[PDB]
Write a protein that binds this DNA or RNA. Structure first.
Length: 138
RNA sequence: UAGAGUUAAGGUGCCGGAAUACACGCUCAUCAACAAAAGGUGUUAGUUCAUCUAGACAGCCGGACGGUGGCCAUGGAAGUCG
């Protein structure tokens, strides 16, 4: 259809779907904002309090969006319970572990996104992020 | 108790007798003429070391990249909170 600006904005996986910044940026532009937040409440249900965008593009009184912008909801979704953990494992704290096959299938995804030389490239890249989230490789 | 012979403590630009001398040197502020914590592109030298044609350093001039909003504090955290 005719689509106007693709409305990017840094936001939480908790805000968009609800009310606050969801409704007014599509409001006078002329969508049905509860069915926009219906589609986005597929994404921000599973991506619960994570760093995730959604592009609220102005279609024919419709919008649909589910965006993981980065490495974000790939590493913690590979943990299989995806909140944000609440900082590092060096304390009396930690997340769990990602499996070797589960962490490297993220690296098999971002190899059309990443410009990877060999198939050991984006492997170590996302293994850095694997220990960042308070997990590890298993 | 007195005139000579020789010199200490210390002086010679001038009031007021005696070098406006000699050699080398930082510095010329009239320094010379009190004062600490605490501090400085005046200005000079020695020693040790990073650094150097294996292109030192400054000014002027650029590339500001793909993954990507990496991850996580948190109401939110965004390279840019921990």
């Amino acid at each position: 259809p005719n689509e106007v600006k693709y409305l990017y904005l840094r936001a939480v996986g908790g805000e968009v779907g609800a009310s606050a910044a969801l409704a007014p940026k599509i409001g006078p532009l002329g969508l049905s904002p509860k069915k926009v937040g219906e589609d986005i409440a597929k994404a921000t249900k599973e991506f619960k309090g994570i760093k995730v965008t959604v592009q609220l593009k102005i279609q024919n009184r419709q919008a649909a969006a589910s965006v993981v912008p980065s490495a974000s909801s790939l590493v913690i979704t590979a943990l299989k319970e995806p909140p944000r953990d609440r900082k590092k494992d060096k304390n009396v704290k930690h997340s769990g572990n990602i499996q070797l096959d589960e962490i490297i299938e993220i690296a098999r995804q971002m190899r059309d996104k990443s410009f990877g030389r060999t198939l050991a490239s984006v492997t170590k890249e996302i293994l850095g992020t694997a220990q960042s989230v308070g997990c590890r490789v298993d």
